[PDB]
């Protein structure tokens, strides 16, 4: 037999995010709506940033405001909230100092301390249940070196 | 770098199931077979039901009779048994009263007492060892409000 | 709501391993490294073997020599040592007699006495600290009936 | 049968924490709230630090301020307090001298005397009961050598 | 090193149970069976109830009738008997008056006198030895304020 | 509140060991080392055997030769010596007659006279102090009816 | 409605590879690049070989040397390393004996023990970061019977 396995990779020499255990971030996450409290469960994962130069600050921002949208009704939207390193991310660029990230906390140089990434969504109107259906959205997290 | 994390969610304003610790139910379970006793281990998890209205009864049923089937032989089947709240579930719809579920037992309104969910399988013929191989199946648990 | 829980199972009519309390073996284990003594902590669990026929001997072997490898450097390796029933396992097949396992020690037929399984790792060079990073590996324990 | 047990380990040649009995620290802890005194129970464990070089000081800090957050409401928070070696830990780095830790108190070189680790939480407003629900959080304890 | 310790807590502002020495109740108990008398040993622990309001009665009940079940045979069952405060608990709700509990017997307000909790099991048929194997079950004790 | 207490039990209809006061045997024991005499303290407990049939002999043996091993060095071992009923136990099976055990010495039928169980360890080389550290081991006592 | 689902299959009566859980191998894999260590993450999957005749040896080779190439610059290349069964694969043909594969380890005849497949890539010049961009490549694994 012949088995053609396609191998693909994306390379950025400067920066990237990886999980605290040394694995790539998940490509998809699942949220749960609970009717009693009218809110969605948050997704939390501990991430470490790998950098080529540890002396420069890190700028984190979102490419666009993420929104959960119904697969059958593009009109219905629900905002998505993303926070990294304990601060809420948005289109405006946040800045993290190199000393705050704690590079080389372990024996590996260029790897910072674990930073928590939180993904969550809320109804667009407070105290109102969202319309039934399946929702989907994309969070475009952009990280660049100072 | 840019990391496109896809966020998806399914919303039902009326009812749903969550674990007793406030987490979504597992998407996959594993059963073990012991050759000496010719039986499979059961999977048990404690679940709590969240409802928009606590005064209505709850109807629980299975969409279809689940069966473990060999991944390499669709002919070989093994029945799966599912029980929730201490009663055996089937295609015929069971009914649970609102008072039996014990809503608002804790300080959170609309959340009932913990109900145990049991997943298990048995050989289709009693006292006969199943054929060797890998088996798989899907349990489609359907819960609706009265 | 509909919740599609996938149920999967692997069946071998002859033999398998289970924990002494009647649970499946863990799918993952964690080792701890202490800088002071340059050695890793061992993982120990008490297991019982279930057999269809108690009169036959048991052959235990490893599919391949396990090694801890760095997730970021496939070149760096650390050997893993596995021992079951008080004897060191390897690629060469060990043999355990049916009388040594003590079948039906309790009231259940076909279940032997508790056998200890030990998982441990050591640096590839004695007296040298391993390179910092996260390591991973797989132990493929193979058990077959005589 | 074949049983694929995944073995993973994290190695830091310089420093780490272990329990006083020579076991890894627990990955999860449980706190208890008492309605009568409006306070949470503290978690206490005796830990020993293992070092490659016993002549250097030890710096202990938290990667971020831990907070207990409701699994269903990311808005509700409760601060977590962590203290090690009798001093309260925070984002600002504490320093412990090598003589204060008492290295080689027993016959093992590079192992210090037992240091107590305390994990506790309190309501964000004094004298006010927290909202009912399930809370979760992560404490990221960072220890590095001087 | 970085050590991510997960901290979790469950909060009910009204009521809860704690041990007489101020510790959380055990999450697991062990029963012993003696062949000579055909009965199981009882588990006894002294508990104190903490309440936000000491003037209201206390309702105690079980979410479902607990049963010991064989880990390898879901058909085999053994009933579990639970009694708190000297009275047998069941699905029907018991009621304890605020004066009978003796609140503030010591210097701490809102804490009652010690109440004994008894967990025990018996064979489903009197005078018959249970089938050999390992048994497990869950007791869901529900306590609410009047 | 809801408190999920897990109840588990192991049943053997034929035989078992219990303490002379009617309690289960301890799951863990502690040994002390005195530098002055290069020996370990022995652990002694008085046990009574409960049997379904008092006319049959009792066979007592160890599943494997117990050894104290260093938690940080699996190479270092220390033998453990176990004796029950005044005779040294080993892998080879001992036999105790029904008349020697003195069944029904008290008013309870099927319960024998008190038999002493001794657990002790010694250095693997006589007159040599063991290496410093923490040691652990498991004694697998197997008792079966004739 | 009419839904035209195209069904296609490739048949080789002699040999093929499947995952250890009985699924086809993935058609695409993703590699992660970390700037700090200047290396790519490896892809590891456990595979089992199915054969028509278990007495013949197995020859494994690559059709051509795989290389990661930039989608926008065909000049930029990065070598891909593939290893199966613990040995590095190349254009020269490796040979695996029928006894080393351990056929019929489980109850299914003609299925061998689990063999690990590793896919990884490295920069063409050691210690040099690859040029930024998206890379792609194909691994043509050829397996034939002796």
From Swiss-Prot, chains A, B, C, D, E, F, G:
Keywords (A to Z) from UniProt: Fimbrium, Plasmid, Signal
Family note: Belongs to the fimbrial CS1 protein family.
Covalent S-S links between cysteines: none
UniProt induction comment: CFA/I fimbriae are only expressed in the presence of the positive regulator CfaD.
Function: Fimbriae (also called pili), polar filaments radiating from the surface of the bacterium to a length of 0.5-1.5 micrometers and numbering 100-300 per cell, enable bacteria to colonize the epithelium of specific host organs.
Keyword Signal among record annotations: yes
Locations listed in the record: Fimbrium
GO cellular component, one term: pilus
Description of how the protein assembles with itself and partners: CFA/I fimbriae are rather rigid, thread-like filaments of 0.5-1 micrometer, with an apparent axial hole, and a diameter of 7 nanometers. A single CFA/I fimbria consists of about 100 identical protein subunits.
Name of this protein: CFA/I fimbrial subunit B
Keyword Signal tagged: yes
Domain of life: Bacteria
């Amino acid at each position: 037999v012949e088995k053609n396995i396609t191998v693909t990779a994306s390379v950025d020499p400067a920066i990237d995010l990886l999980q605290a255990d040394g694995n790539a971030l998940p490509s998809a996450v699942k949220l749960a709506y609970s009717p009693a409290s009218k809110t969605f469960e948050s997704y939390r994962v501990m991430t470490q940033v790998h950098t080529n130069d540890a002396t420069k600050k890190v700028i984190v921002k979102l490419a666009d405001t993420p929104q959960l949208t119904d697969v059958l009704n593009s009109t219905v939207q629900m905002p998505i909230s993303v926070s990294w390193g304990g601060q809420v991310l948005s289109t405006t660029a946040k800045e993290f100092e190199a000393a705050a990230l704690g590079y080389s906390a372990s024996g590996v140089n260029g790897v910072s301390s674990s930073q928590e990434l939180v993904i969550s969504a809320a109804p667009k109107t407070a105290g109102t249940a969202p319309t039934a259906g399946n929702y989907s959205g994309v969070v475009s997290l952009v990280m660049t070196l100072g």
